[PDB]
Symmetry: none
Amino acid sequence: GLLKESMRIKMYMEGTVNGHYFKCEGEGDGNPFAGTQSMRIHVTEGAPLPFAFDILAPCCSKTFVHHTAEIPDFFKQSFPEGFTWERTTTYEDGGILTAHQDTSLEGNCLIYKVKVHGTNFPADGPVMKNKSGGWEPSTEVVYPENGVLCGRNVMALKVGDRHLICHHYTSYRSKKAVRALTMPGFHFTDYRLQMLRKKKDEYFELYEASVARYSDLPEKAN
Amino acid sequence: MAGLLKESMRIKMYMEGTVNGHYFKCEGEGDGNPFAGTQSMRIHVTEGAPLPFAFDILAPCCSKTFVHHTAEIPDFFKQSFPEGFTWERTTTYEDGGILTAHQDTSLEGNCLIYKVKVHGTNFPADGPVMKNKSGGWEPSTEVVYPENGVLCGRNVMALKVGDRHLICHHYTSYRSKKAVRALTMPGFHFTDYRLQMLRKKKDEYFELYEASVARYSDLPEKA
Amino acid sequence: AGLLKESMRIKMYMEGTVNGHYFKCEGEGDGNPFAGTQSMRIHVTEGAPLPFAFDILAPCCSKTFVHHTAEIPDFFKQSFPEGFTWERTTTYEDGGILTAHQDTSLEGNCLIYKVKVHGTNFPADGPVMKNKSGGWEPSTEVVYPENGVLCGRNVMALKVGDRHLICHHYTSYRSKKAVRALTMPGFHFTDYRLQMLRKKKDEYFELYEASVARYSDLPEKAN
Amino acid sequence: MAGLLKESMRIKMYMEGTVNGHYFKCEGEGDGNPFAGTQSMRIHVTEGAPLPFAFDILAPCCSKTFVHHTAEIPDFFKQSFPEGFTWERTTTYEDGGILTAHQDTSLEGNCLIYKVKVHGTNFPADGPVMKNKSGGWEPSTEVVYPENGVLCGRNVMALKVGDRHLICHHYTSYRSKKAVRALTMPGFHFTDYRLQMLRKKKDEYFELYEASVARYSDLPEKA
Ligand SMILES: [Cl-]
């Protein structure tokens, strides 16, 4: 078992949102097979963040997805080489956040290097006014395109009693040769990302559960 | 299930529109169980046949009265009757197509009446839609949430094209024709769909089957 | 030579929905096709008072009236007597999307416009739905051929107090003449200044527009 | 024009990034007249040569100090010195590619120093960028407007591919490193550009020339 039922996580993230530079460091832990994980994040440069960390939380880990129904596991198959991902997230009120990430494995420790770039968040919107209240659960659509795994997702940011919708466009690339990977079929991945604590716009505690699965609806023969 | 909506309902659908300058009209005859969330429909292109594009793009225009609602989720669509409801959609395809739709849903005794108008443009002339090379839809999960008396939907849809998929994006709004005070809005939730094309002939006759369920996420919440 | 005159009549029939709100309106206008200037008076006959800013409909209301400089071939004036159509998607950076399609025909000295609009997802508290906008800045469209179809892209800026809300035009213009019967222009620009001169009770609007097709004014270097 | 900024300035540029996973670094030396709005630059690819993609997508990353300002439009960029300014851009290509850039502009005596970091992805493997089959940019017209103390820009760019064009869209923000209270913001205006690639060798050496002018619309405004 190259992955253990308890893993450490170390994350290094930097970037800008509406021109505001930040750097933070995360340390976390999780069970890759149960699909559960947590992370503590400290903003070491650019604190206090003048925007909602909610927009950075989904940049902070698909080794920790519980795979059901024998769905091949693109991410766990990628080790020891690891994998990368790229995402564009569009917010319906104008914000755009791109991110790219490198995932590597050193012994018991997964290591994440993330670069983010957010632009055009409206100055009076809930992101820049820092008035959001976490994410709803979501369900990602996942499917192969050659040797690359593609993802699409609708996410809903809680803003008071209403929602601000954004759209995920993600590509996951293995550092293993496509020859040595068994790609999944089309499937879904459920997520529930929770922010358990936040302090002074410089400290955040995350928890995430994730499950890969097929549609629950029966398929009518004909 | 003994009142305005019963365990077996009939459906009549009238659709017309233009896609990439190609005019057509369709009529649908269908039936289903609105409480079990299952339904079928037989569609005949009555004008503009053979369709010079994949009927797949029109199938999701062809019925949310037939959603099985779990976990006591308020049912926006069933609550709307006898008056009924309307819906509108903008769909964007990642290779350029854009399809817009207006729909009205009315009741006539045991029969639901659907009146749909669609407009599509910018579908690539050599893409799978205009070349009629798609292979039906994958199942999907819509995000459903209220916004000031209106029900909103968002969905990622995946059209099968050989071994690959072409992605499109639904932006849907649902409006009741009942007075606003008489409706109990749901909260944020999901609706699963599986839309299947069971028969097609001559780019003129199509047969659909659909199951849908409204529900919350199955994932536990960490306290 | 001929067909179009120094003064033309314009009649416009427009209908559609914005955020579910249906409206119909009728315009009568006039202009000088060769000077590139025109005006229109618009009466909302159904759905008044409009619960949204008519600014978003004003660019749906006429490219026969573009002054063509530097001998740029005139796709629109060449299209008569047959006429032409256009299709546009406009995305607003705060979420709105407005599609429209239009038919342009010519009868005597009267240009006849038939427009259909479908706007969705305008934010309920944004300046469009709150009716708080203050007209358009001038703009410069990019215009270029793609196999007999004329394409257009434009950045538009809606004035909201002392700020701007940006939207993006994606336009396609199609002639009803055969491809062989008309000379396509090359890549070029079209300047616009659309002004709303009067508005009353969200049911009556007066437009004025000036437009010029031209090349970049910047010199071209050596190589 | 005898103080910090003179009629002849030098430029040194440092650029690095990855496009579709391909790492590169390049260095530029340039010069120009910031008041007349003309400049040139000779670029060497120092890492990752030969570039496996069209350098055209990087040329607009390679200088707003050299904009000729007309009609007394306040000059956000020249006002920022000696401290300088930064800019950021997101560019979306209609065939799928996306390019992001961060840039810092500083002053060293008579030399402007540019530090650029770029990230591009989703360019189609068979597209004109990754297959290196593009042919330079058309001229363009940027829309420039203030939002608080930040200058915003939007632009439609048209890359020549044979006799056709691939469109992309600029979303640019410009931020001054001089104190906010020391800045006179412009109003809404336009900036014309013409960026020309006068020389290229072995996908490793490139020569650019650029002219740009800030102005208002040429169209008269109505009573
Ligand atoms: Cl706190």
